[PDB]
Symmetry: C5
Subunit: 109 residues, 5 copies
């Protein structure tokens, strides 16, 4: 079971299209205040307290994506897009949403 942002997989052929699947996670305001609010200058994943939160949010979004694909009998999700959207009163909640297309594949050889 592979995940790709590309619409096809070289070396394989998609033998069935099983629909659009989705995963998501929301980081609560508390996580934003604790790890994001204090950021000074430009801070990348490697150094920052926030990256472990984003990563957890991604990891959860992807598992939901994969499990939805699993339930359809798909073995890949292609054409994947990941979006981040700020939600809530204080612009302090974060939604990570993944979407792609569940597919059955066959090796070309």
């Amino acid at each position: 079971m592979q995940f790709s942002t590309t619409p096809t997989l070289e070396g394989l052929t998609i033998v069935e299209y099983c629909g659009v699947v989705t995963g998501e996670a929301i980081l609560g305001a508390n996580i934003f205040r604790d790890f994001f609010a204090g950021i000074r200058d430009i801070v990348g994943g490697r150094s920052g307290a926030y990256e472990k939160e984003l990563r957890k949010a991604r990891e959860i979004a992807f598992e939901e994506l994969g499990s939805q694909a699993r339930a359809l009998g798909a073995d890949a999700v292609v054409g994947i897009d990941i979006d981040y959207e700020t939600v809530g009163q204080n612009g302090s909640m974060l939604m990570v949403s993944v979407s792609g297309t569940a597919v059955k594949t066959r090796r070309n050889i």
Copy 2:
């Protein structure tokens, strides 16, 4: 009726492009207040109350996009994109927007 984030469907060829179609749904601030605002820590679709609502907004949006396609004489919507946009003063309304290209397909066999 097939929906894909990919621009083509292997196994088929598109014989008509019938134009860009859309669907959307808006979750009002009452929904946001009730299911989204109290979120603590990181909450994925599995555990959280909000997920029922997102899902219902998505299905409704796809239904609208599906009806637009079907009305046009199309049998697939390809090159699909789903966007989420918060709107309104309090950032407490959520818009789910879907778009794609309605197409007529013919099987390669």
Copy 3:
């Protein structure tokens, strides 16, 4: 004039790439107050008054997009993206932007 969110059109060949074209429309705060504010629960574009306004805005944006393409001598716009952006001091203005690539095509037959 054909519009597609796919980068190519099966059955035709792109003979000329004529550049990136765009179209937009902005729905003012008065539209938002009148049609979007205080939407309650989850409302789809099918039953919602707001959709008449969104449909109008997308219509106008595509006209502009179609009109830019025409002036370059194109007969299609491919690889189209549509996004919605909330703008302004009160998050009560919506901008719809379309973009894509103006192209000249030749039917394979």
Copy 4:
């Protein structure tokens, strides 16, 4: 210099991929208050004066994008994305971001 939102150019072959390039421009609050804040109803870019400002913004973004590509030795930018983000305390600044992949091409004839 050719600009496209599609990944390939029909009629050409990409012989070298030279990396991701970007360009951008920010529209200040003053321009926003002058051209965007007063909009009533639905105004399209064809008649709306704000559109002169957006097109100036995009043009600057594409200038940067193409000059970046020029320096890498490229002759096209493919797989282009255009994005708008509202930024600042009053949702009254607008950033136009463009990205794509700089490439050398070879005409098939």
Copy 5:
């Protein structure tokens, strides 16, 4: 290594897909106040002081994307997307996110 917003690389064949990779950087409120908040009129990356900041954030994100791909055995990241999201209480923080699909490639010659 090779970064592309295209899903394939003409002249090469993708021999393995190694999963979706991400990188990101956050620009803190202080950078925003010092470089973005004062902008007047329309200011492009070529001339704006904000540009070295965005450039720096992009570089950190791509580095993270880069090493993530390396750790998986990959020699290229294709299907790349860059998104900018304004986050926080005062719309004065900016997240730059990059995602793509890590791959192994083989020269066709």
